[PDB]
Design an enzyme around this catalytic site. Structure first.
Site, PDB file in Angstrom:
ATOM      1  N   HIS A  81      -3.433  -7.778  -4.021  1.00  0.00           N
ATOM      2  CA  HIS A  81      -3.573  -6.869  -2.988  1.00  0.00           C
ATOM      3  C   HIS A  81      -3.915  -7.575  -1.636  1.00  0.00           C
ATOM      4  CE1 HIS A  81      -4.158  -3.064  -0.555  1.00  0.00           C
ATOM      5  NE2 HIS A  81      -5.377  -3.310  -0.733  1.00  0.00           N
ATOM      6  N   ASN A 133      -8.119  -2.792  -3.406  1.00  0.00           N
ATOM      7  CA  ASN A 133      -9.671  -2.407  -2.985  1.00  0.00           C
ATOM      8  C   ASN A 133      -9.930  -1.170  -3.363  1.00  0.00           C
ATOM      9  OD1 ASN A 133      -7.732  -2.603  -0.726  1.00  0.00           O
ATOM     10  ND2 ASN A 133      -9.782  -1.671   0.507  1.00  0.00           N
ATOM     11  N   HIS A 134      -8.765  -0.181  -3.130  1.00  0.00           N
ATOM     12  CA  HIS A 134      -9.050   1.220  -3.188  1.00  0.00           C
ATOM     13  C   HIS A 134      -8.911   1.777  -4.685  1.00  0.00           C
ATOM     14  CE1 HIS A 134      -9.700   2.855   0.941  1.00  0.00           C
ATOM     15  NE2 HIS A 134      -9.034   1.683   1.275  1.00  0.00           N
ATOM     16  N   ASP A 189       0.728  -1.167   0.000  1.00  0.00           N
ATOM     17  CA  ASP A 189       0.020  -0.047  -0.054  1.00  0.00           C
ATOM     18  C   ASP A 189       0.983   1.180  -0.044  1.00  0.00           C
ATOM     19  OD1 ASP A 189      -1.380  -2.575   1.298  1.00  0.00           O
ATOM     20  OD2 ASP A 189      -3.060  -1.219   1.363  1.00  0.00           O
ATOM     21  N   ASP A 244      -3.632  -0.290  -3.991  1.00  0.00           N
ATOM     22  CA  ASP A 244      -3.844   0.510  -2.948  1.00  0.00           C
ATOM     23  C   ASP A 244      -2.891   1.964  -3.312  1.00  0.00           C
ATOM     24  OD1 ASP A 244      -5.840  -0.288  -1.837  1.00  0.00           O
ATOM     25  OD2 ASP A 244      -5.054  -0.291   0.252  1.00  0.00           O
ATOM     26  N   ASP A 270      -6.299   7.137  -2.008  1.00  0.00           N
ATOM     27  CA  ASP A 270      -7.241   7.346  -0.885  1.00  0.00           C
ATOM     28  C   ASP A 270      -6.488   7.322   0.325  1.00  0.00           C
ATOM     29  OD1 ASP A 270      -9.637   7.233  -2.374  1.00  0.00           O
ATOM     30  OD2 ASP A 270      -9.248   4.908  -2.510  1.00  0.00           O
ATOM     31  N   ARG A 271      -6.833   8.062   1.461  1.00  0.00           N
ATOM     32  CA  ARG A 271      -6.370   8.454   2.779  1.00  0.00           C
ATOM     33  C   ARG A 271      -5.229   9.484   2.642  1.00  0.00           C
ATOM     34  NH1 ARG A 271      -7.529   3.128   4.105  1.00  0.00           N
ATOM     35  NH2 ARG A 271      -9.631   2.782   5.046  1.00  0.00           N
ATOM     36  N   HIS A 310      -0.913   4.801  -0.418  1.00  0.00           N
ATOM     37  CA  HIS A 310      -2.087   5.483  -0.103  1.00  0.00           C
ATOM     38  C   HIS A 310      -1.719   6.895  -0.238  1.00  0.00           C
ATOM     39  CE1 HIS A 310      -5.044   2.997   1.184  1.00  0.00           C
ATOM     40  NE2 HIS A 310      -4.434   2.138   1.897  1.00  0.00           N
ATOM     41  N   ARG A 325     -13.953  -6.717   7.984  1.00  0.00           N
ATOM     42  CA  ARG A 325     -14.256  -5.727   7.206  1.00  0.00           C
ATOM     43  C   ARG A 325     -15.581  -5.871   6.745  1.00  0.00           C
ATOM     44  NH1 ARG A 325      -9.626  -3.767   5.298  1.00  0.00           N
ATOM     45  NH2 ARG A 325      -7.595  -4.884   5.520  1.00  0.00           N
ATOM     46  N   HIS A 354      -2.928  -4.981   1.720  1.00  0.00           N
ATOM     47  CA  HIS A 354      -3.943  -4.514   2.398  1.00  0.00           C
ATOM     48  C   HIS A 354      -4.216  -4.500   3.872  1.00  0.00           C
ATOM     49  CE1 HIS A 354      -8.368  -5.014   1.865  1.00  0.00           C
ATOM     50  NE2 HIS A 354      -8.544  -5.710   2.868  1.00  0.00           N
TER      51      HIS A 354
HETATM   52 MN   LIG Z   1      -6.601  -2.476   1.149  1.00  0.00          MN
HETATM   53 MN   LIG Z   2      -5.027   0.523   2.815  1.00  0.00          MN
END
Ligand SMILES: [Mn+2]
Ligand SMILES: [Mn+2]
Length: 471
Positions: free
Chosen positions: A324, A275-276, A214, A243, A246-247, A216, A372, A399
């Site tokens: 991921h 997933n993002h 990730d 990923d 995001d964030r 991010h 989740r 992840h």
């Molecule tokens: Mn993730």
């Molecule tokens: Mn993440």
């Protein structure tokens, strides 16, 4: 009989929540729960601890339960709202804010929240009813400005010169020009769309490849990786395990820098979907919000289009498989199954492609309901099965945040790699990248740390109901 002992863990779990030790905060709220399972507070806190750890499903569980054992636990209603929010459940969250603005009529904010969630609920649904690029002109129309002093695509090509320039540009804020950004997006989509769902690479006896997890939007950490481990190239390949956005508040810099290198070294620079890299997630965690602030709400539409053409998994020398999230819910699943997946689209609420981006490994044996709320968890047996049934040694996934940047589980069959240090300027975790060598596919962990970045707090985009949730 021990209501004193029950609350001895209501501060030995309600304590480690301060030291940001949510893994222990949880493990103790539970023990406290097991002794006295009728205290709404215990559940309410364990719920927040799940929020801080992104275990939205469980967070929703504890919240709901906290609300049953006490309808006067305002905390519980909020904690549950956040849970729904995170999963994207609009109305479900609105109904909770509604229930609060009533029991607390003169409660300011409570209205700010109801009116806020409302706005979104109306819109989200408001959007209903063909190819996006078929529209915008780009090379044609798209002009540029003599006033524009940044990176220009040398003949819309992407050069090692442009990349370094682009990175410096980004290190100093400043956005690449729309015409270049669109050109990069159109080309990467072209290139990505021609790749199978399961990229398969062959690493020579000698010759390494680097695996990152990730990112991010933590752009200034992406650069720390490139400095610490060398810029991408045919002699120094890379693979980013999803990923990228995001964030983090620099997802646009991170993403365009990655797609950029994808175009420069399309056979030595790999990106897998996370997933993002999904619309549902993009509209809650910042990317959409960030893309629209820096560009047009149409640039974003093109992003999510290329995001759908990102491979779902990659296999190195038939021995190591990386994706991921993790392994699957169903027991069949084979390497061929993956290859034949219709990637180009949003993910199913369950099934392979879904597990491929959302599943988490589990210490115990067998599947389980994901913390989740999507996909599932899986035990070392499930990992061994899959591994065996496909002649794979082990898997590398990301992840999940990890204090030490990585984690080896299931006897060494399930490896987690995380590349976002100090996750959201709050976790304070180290991060790592893996060196994989052809002659010895043994994971070679390399840890890296912090590294400073301009101001701008995490999730500086996206409606405020979230920024106020994550902290
Ligand atoms: Mn993730
Ligand atoms: Mn993440």
């Amino acid at each position: 009989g021990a209501l004193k002992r029950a609350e001895e863990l209501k501060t030995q779990a309600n304590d480690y929540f301060k030291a940001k030790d949510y893994e222990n905060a949880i493990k103790f709220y539970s023990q406290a729960i097991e002794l006295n399972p009728s205290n709404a507070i215990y559940y309410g806190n364990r719920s927040l601890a799940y929020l801080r750890t992104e275990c939205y499903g469980y967070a929703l569980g504890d919240a709901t339960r906290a609300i049953e054992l006490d309808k006067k636990y305002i905390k519980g209603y909020y904690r549950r709202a956040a849970s729904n929010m995170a999963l994207g459940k609009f109305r479900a969250a609105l109904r909770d804010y509604e229930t609060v603005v009533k029991v607390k009529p003169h409660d300011k904010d409570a209205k700010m929240k109801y009116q806020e969630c409302n706005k979104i609920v109306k819109q989200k649904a408001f959007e209903r009813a063909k190819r996006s690029v078929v529209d915008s002109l780009d090379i044609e129309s798209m002009t540029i400005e003599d006033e524009y002093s940044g990176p220009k695509l040398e003949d819309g090509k992407v050069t090692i010169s442009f990349m370094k320039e682009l990175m410096q540009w980004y290190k100093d804020q400043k956005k690449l020009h729309r015409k270049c950004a669109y050109q990069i997006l159109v080309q990467v989509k072209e290139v990505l769309s021609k790749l199978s769902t399961l990229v398969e690479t062959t690493l020579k006896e000698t010759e390494k490849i680097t695996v990152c997890g990730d990112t991010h939007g933590q752009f200034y950490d992406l650069l720390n990786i490139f400095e610490l481990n060398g810029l991408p190239s045919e002699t120094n390949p890379y693979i980013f395990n999803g990923d990228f956005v995001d964030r983090g508040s620099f997802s646009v810099e991170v993403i365009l820098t990655l797609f950029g290198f994808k175009l420069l070294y399309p056979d030595h620079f790999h990106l897998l979907r996370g997933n993002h890299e999904t619309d549902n997630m993009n509209q809650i965690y910042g990317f959409e919000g960030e893309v629209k602030a820096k560009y047009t709400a149409q640039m974003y539409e093109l992003f999510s289009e290329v995001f759908e053409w990102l491979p779902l998994a990659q296999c190195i020398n038939g021995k190591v498989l990386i994706m991921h999230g993790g392994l699957f819910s169903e027991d069949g699943v084979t390497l061929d199954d993956i290859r034949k997946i219709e990637r180009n689209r949003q993910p199913p609420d369950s099934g392979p492609m879904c597990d491929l981006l959302w599943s988490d490994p589990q210490p115990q044996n067998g599947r389980s309901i994901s913390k989740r709320g999507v996909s599932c968890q899986f035990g070392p047996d499930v990992t061994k099965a899959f591994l065996e049934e496909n002649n794979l040694d082990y898997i590398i996934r990301s992840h999940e945040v990890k204090a030490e940047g990585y984690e080896v589980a299931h006897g060494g069959r399930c490896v987690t790699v995380f590349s976002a240090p100090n996750y959201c300027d709050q976790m304070g975790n180290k991060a790592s990248y893996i060196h994989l060598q052809g002659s010895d596919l043994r994971p070679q962990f390399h840890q890296f740390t912090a590294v400073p970045h301009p101001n701008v707090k995490p999730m500086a985009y996206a409606n405020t109901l979230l920024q106020l949730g994550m902290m």
